[PDB]
Design a binder for this molecule. Sequence first.
Ligand SMILES: CO[C@]1(C(=O)O)CCN(C(=O)c2ncnc3[nH]ccc23)C1
Length: 164
Amino acid sequence: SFSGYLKLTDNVYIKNADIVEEAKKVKPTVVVNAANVYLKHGGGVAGALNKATNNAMQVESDDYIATNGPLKVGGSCVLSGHNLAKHCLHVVGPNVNKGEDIQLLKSAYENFNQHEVLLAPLLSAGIFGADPIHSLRVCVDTVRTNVYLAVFDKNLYDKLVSSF
Ligand SMILES: CO[C@]1(C(=O)O)CCN(C(=O)c2ncnc3[nH]ccc23)C1
C-alpha cells in the first residue's frame, strides 16, 4: 500500500517522491501519466514513465493513436501500466507553454473520478507551464476518488504543503 503520505483532505494525499520509483515499489492499480494529445512521451513525467517501461509504453501508445487519432485536451485514455501498474491513465492537461486554455485543467482532473484510487502527478505542472499551487487547488476541488500525489521537486513539495 501507499506509505509516507501527508493527508491534505478526506481523499487527497501528497508525498515528495519520484513517481517512477513510487510506481515500481507500490505497483498501484492505476498510475496517471501527464500526456499530450499525441501520446508522444518524450520528456517530463511522460518521458520518465516511458523510459522505465523500456519504451513499451510508447509502442503501445503509437498503436493506439494509429487506430483512434489524438486525444482531446482535457481527455484521457486507459492503456497498460506495463511494469509500473496494472493500468496507466493517460491524461491531457492544458499546456500553457503551447498557449492552451487553463480552464481545461478541471476537465482533465475529472477523468480521475472514473478510478477508485490513483497514483498521480500534478497535471499541467512542470514543463506544461501552469502554477502547481493552482493545479493542486483544482485537484482537491475536482477529484472525489482517492488520489496519491507524487511531487518530484523537494522545494516545490514544501511550498505546496505550507501554502495549502
Ligand atoms: C509538480 O511539479 C513537478 C514536480 O515536481 O512533480 C515538476 C516536474 N513534474 C513532473 O511531473 C516531472 N517533470 C519532469 N521529469 C520528471 N520525472 C518525474 C516526474 C517529472 C511536475
